[PDB]
């Protein structure tokens, strides 16, 4: 049979024998391998069912949003500055974070897509003729010189990779290799950061992947416009090791694994059933 | 009450009979009957009636 | 909080109970009778709140 | 230049495509791999592994370890019901939150048979017999042991081997069944009845515990990826 | 010649004015192979105890008649071990042999269309009103089309010129059919294989096809002729098998 | 240097063509066609083998 | 990069093209096919199948089963007309609503000959003879049997074989004829005349019925897809 | 001869024989195979006429609209919300529905096209500078988490397929495999939904293909704009089984096969004709 | 892996080229060139064969 | 995808070019040709044929 093709059921007959395929011991920590043709009479069906949609490349290989980066053209505060930043971490959304905490160690190549959607800010009037705005996305490695403000010559992208995008076109895409220093992306790091067992606890000390700085290249606009940059990670060529139990309780913090307690499942009213 | 259909469709070879032509309130499940203009003749295979559906839309009006 | 289950509608002797939307709160069911049978009671039932628990709005027809 | 023409579908971002894209760190030397033990190449490898099912959810027992404990005791009349739940391994409250529940809830279809492995966690001198039954969804819930002996069943005898595997087979008119349940692809009911009784020597407590594990066989298959209705959020995490 | 004899089970049927046998869409009924099957259980296959000529009740051909429709297998639900294997089993897969028979004379006239319509989904009489499950198909009595349109509140549409489904009634001749023309023909026989998109299905919530007979040219004779000509249907399952034995249904 | 492999079709013109353009390997397409699996690390992680017909104790 | 240049026709949505397009569920395992009986590979397979034609439309008889019933009775003078209609198998009121009418109305051209199969549905002791004639559209409608015997005709004798197939041939100056009729491609007239009479023994009713079926031969062909003027709508269905 | 090529007429002569190709019996349910050269004298013509435009791939293989999805940028009701939905069914238009109820069982691969046309809502004034709006079309499978509102993190497309589209470009296209769980798309399902012969009747219980959620990615607009999203299904690699009679009476409901009665055809005044 | 087949031309340079790009089979073009037909299931669905020249009864 | 770059001349309608363009009636069966007499394959075939010249135009 081909690869990824599930096994079929062989024929069976009415047995009366000293072989017990149904009796086992869970105390050995061994899951049973009972075919349905062991405990009853089955025919010979042929299963053409493939296990294609279960592999880690077919499972993780769908693009999921990880951040909503907001910036503007006229600074009103430091949450809506002329530029912005994003410390690179995949633990800020709730959908992709659960897919990556199903395995302990992963090793995946990435490809990043930005869906940047400007929208006009509310004001007294709105009538203006605006050229199509241009966005710059610079990736500062861990330790590089961050831009303290707009109109700063740290945005020169002398060695850091930077993408540019004039509005109306296709979204930008770039691919990223396996950027760790170990041999796998540790999703969980049960330990401290300093050697005297102190500092910060958990996977915060291992996530050192840099920053990601967004800005408008166009200098002015007659009436200001608030842009929204959404980042779409998608893993590929992925390996995964040591599967975890999937997380029950919903998240609280983007660096901790802090959680409230809840029940294991939804409660019914009685253990049995009643209908004739 | 209070959710009335709009006016029935302008068919080029049909018109509304009295008293359906003057009123503008049609509830759901109402019926309207069609006599036609003084140039046309009734086709016997069809039924010249339209109903309001649940979603405030008249039924499919084929030419009568 | 999740929705509250109404009591089970049971069975109409010589009739048909349509449950197309469960028996939770705000769910609507319907009744009808067999060939050559008379329906004494409402055609459709609804689950509304009565104080603290959920009950059906009307009992079941026989049928006759 | 070369004469081309753009088909419909250009300049779009399909969320589930595959395309080459220019690398941002060219000629980058990734770190060499090592042989870490415990590699997963397939999500069906995890779904073939047992996990104890919280059958005793009633009522408010989910906030303790009494959820997994199915209680058995010496009876006065044989043929009574131990437990019972519908066979909906992605939607039923017993089975949707286990290890076969959290992986199956990421999908929309599922095929193949399953297992239901038991474990008597009582005293070593006690003795019981049970009848675990899976009935296809035609005639409704089996009312007594006489109605449930007609379907699929397995008579489990409690001895030195302290486990018995009811392998719930695959009987369906459709090749796949939906995870979130529709009435076209309903799958059945799992019951368990006192075959004889529990008979104990003196100086042994009455209330015992049976642990129930669920797994998939080697013909399970899932399809049609979606997102799980278990982890929600309102705002971004900071 | 014009004589044929069918023998299924312990019962046989002989004809002497028989046109031909219309074997469905060119398919003789067979068993489920090992590569089309889905259910992993072992099926029970009763050869002689089920596959035999169960005769229904004979309906009367009035001069003002419209037509009648049966709905299978639910019209075979209280005949023999068919109606007992249908209760104790979730699935079920079978083909049929339908023998509609009507003799009058060489002084009567009339012509029936005898058709087997797969999945004749019927429209409501009064819309926005779900109709009853016994106004479509009772267990043994056939059903009857009306001569004009229906105004029932919880029934189907029984205007016979629209065939119930909403199509023109003369366009039914692509479904495997015959005719019972009292000038020449006497009995019509159709061998219908199992037609469904699934290998096996439930027997109670799904009527796999629908046998409609419709008088096109009406029954007219002399007033001194025989004023009662009956129409009997004699349907036999073929190659039946069932799967998933549980307790008796069908709720 | 072209590569021609098998498309994903159902089981009762069936090829495709892949040219890698960029010089790296992070710039490849997804590897959607690896269906190898070995679940005996998680189902049978035992030291002494246990035959399914013999008693485990 | 590679120098290209967009031709006219880029970024358009032609409603009747064919282009590859990236799948939204990649590596999806579709369900295996089974041998369902009754496969249609061509719309001309349905159009070669008979269907009874409602010739007796007059007047208001379409709301009953009297539409299909062509009546015949014992005559006083031979050579009278049984029925008659134009040969327009997509536009004439007799033939546009049958099984050869609903498939042909999806198209705009049609070629090839047709059939017109009859069936005497009278008493088994009665006896008749008929002359079914198809006349090409040159000289107009044939007025009597003497004018209609000159064209194509078939003398049908009513015996033990209770059917006769007039095969209306293909005589035209154009390779195709339009479905909705234009005067350049008019196709003819189909008549039927009493060849001798109906002669019956006593104690048999007078009014009989002849059923008329239409089909296509093995040289039919259709062309130039369009949308049918039979199913209309105003708003969306909910 | 080549495939799909209709047969030609052989030569014939004036016969006088015991062979009767014209006399047959319809009572056998057999359509006659009378060549025109059987009942008259014909020449030997050669027919080059191909049956290309009749096959199910050439017949069904034309894109037909199935829905008109309306949504806006400022919510006024729940029919013109900030987002919308569409329960996926091909029985809401009258043109494609009749082409699919000509066969009982079909098995076709699909390819979907969206023609999304914004249009400015009426107001007091209209003068504004607007960035090109971006649309998101998410496909929720049957059972997934639906977005209760805009600005909800169910729109994260963590695993569901989603397309994005900036206005001005070509329309989006994606292809869909045979998505059923049976072995064919049952257009007609003569049966009930529950086992006690109740519930809902017909093909409503078998149409479980999910939803399709549309929204504007751009957060604001100075003066609101009502968009109209039209969905264009087109079947391909199509098989078709058990042909039905084509439907006479026009439709009423999008889930029932409810209908009013009508005559079989259009009525004339007399059965014969009269002209010399 | 290229495929070269016959174009659709009339009957009294005639080729085309198809490269499948995507890895699936749902992402193919339309199969507009299958003209096989078998209408004897609907025209002749009988058990005993009936020759068109012999009488059917 | 494949890296391309548009030359000058894209998205134009040159009135005298030749380019393939997707057909609107695919798999259409055109009608078979017949041998009509008098085929012109060239406009110079007509220009080699005599024609009487109006030399006496004067006047009116
Ligand atoms: C021109 C812009 C290029 C942007 C380059 C950014 C590439 C860096 C992305 C790092 C990829 C790994 C992300 C981290 C995953 C972690 O291992 C786990 N989520 C642990 O939290
Ligand atoms: C990114 C958006 C992708 C959208 C994916 C939608 C694909 C689902 C479409 C289902 C295809 C079959 C449609 C149903 C046809 C039925 O069998 C018949 N019409 C019965 O009503
Ligand atoms: C990146 C190459 C762009 C050139 C245009 C595409 C054609 C490449 C395939 C044919 C030449 C390579 C043959 C093999 O290798
Ligand atoms: C998907 C391939 C894109 C490369 C450029 C198109 C050239 C492909 C045809 C030539 C190389 C393949 C030869 C065969 O196979």
Numbering used by the authors:
A (entry chain A), H (entry chain A): 9 to 284
B (entry chain E): 62 to 125
C (entry chain E): 126 to 189
D (entry chain C), G (entry chain C): 1 to 238
E (entry chain B): 11 to 261
F (entry chain D), I (entry chain D): 2 to 13, 24 to 68
J (entry chain C): 1 to 60
What do the authors say?
The genus Enterovirus within the Picornaviridae, a family of non-enveloped viruses with a positive single-stranded RNA genome, is comprised of more than 100 serotypes. Human enteroviruses (EV) are presently classified into four groups, Enterovirus A-D (EV-A, B, C, and D), among which EV-B, the largest group, consists of over 60 serotypes, including all 6 serotypes of coxsackievirus B (CVB1-6), coxsackievirus A9 (CVA9), over 30 serotypes of echoviruses and more than 20 newly identified enteroviruses. The capsid proteins (VP1, VP2, and VP3) adopt the classical eight-stranded anti-parallel β-barrel configuration with the N-termini residing inside and the C-termini exposed on the surface. Most of the uncoating receptors bind to the “canyon” sites of the viral particle, dislodging the “pocket factor” in VP1 and subsequently triggering conformational changes of the intact particle to release the genome, albeit that SCARB2 binds EV71 outside the canyon.
We also determined the atomic structures of E30 in complex with its receptor FcRn and CD55. We determined the cryo-EM structures of E30 F-particle in complex with FcRn and CD55 under neutral conditions at 3.3 Å and 3.6 Å, respectively and obtained atomic models for these two complexes. Bindings of FcRn and CD55 have minimal impact on the capsid structure with RMSDs of 0.3 Å and 0.4 Å, respectively between mature and complexed viruses. However, in FcRn-bound viruses, the pocket factor was released and the pocket partially collapsed with the side chains of Tyr147, Asn215, and Met217 repositioning to decrease the pocket volume, similar to the pocket observed in E-particle, whilst there is no notable reduction in the amount of the pocket factor in CD55-bound viruses, indicative of that FcRn is capable of triggering viral pocket factor dislodgement, but CD55 might only facilitate viral attachment at neutral pH. Compared to FcRn, the interactions between E30 and CD55 are reduced by nearly half, where the short consensus repeat (SCR) 3 of CD55 contacts both VP1 GH and VP2 EF loops in E30 via hydrophilic interactions. In addition, CD55 presents a distinct attachment pattern to E30 in that the binding site lies outside the canyon, extending to the “south”. This site is roughly similar to those observed for SCARB2 binding to EV71 and for integrin binding to foot and mouth disease virus.
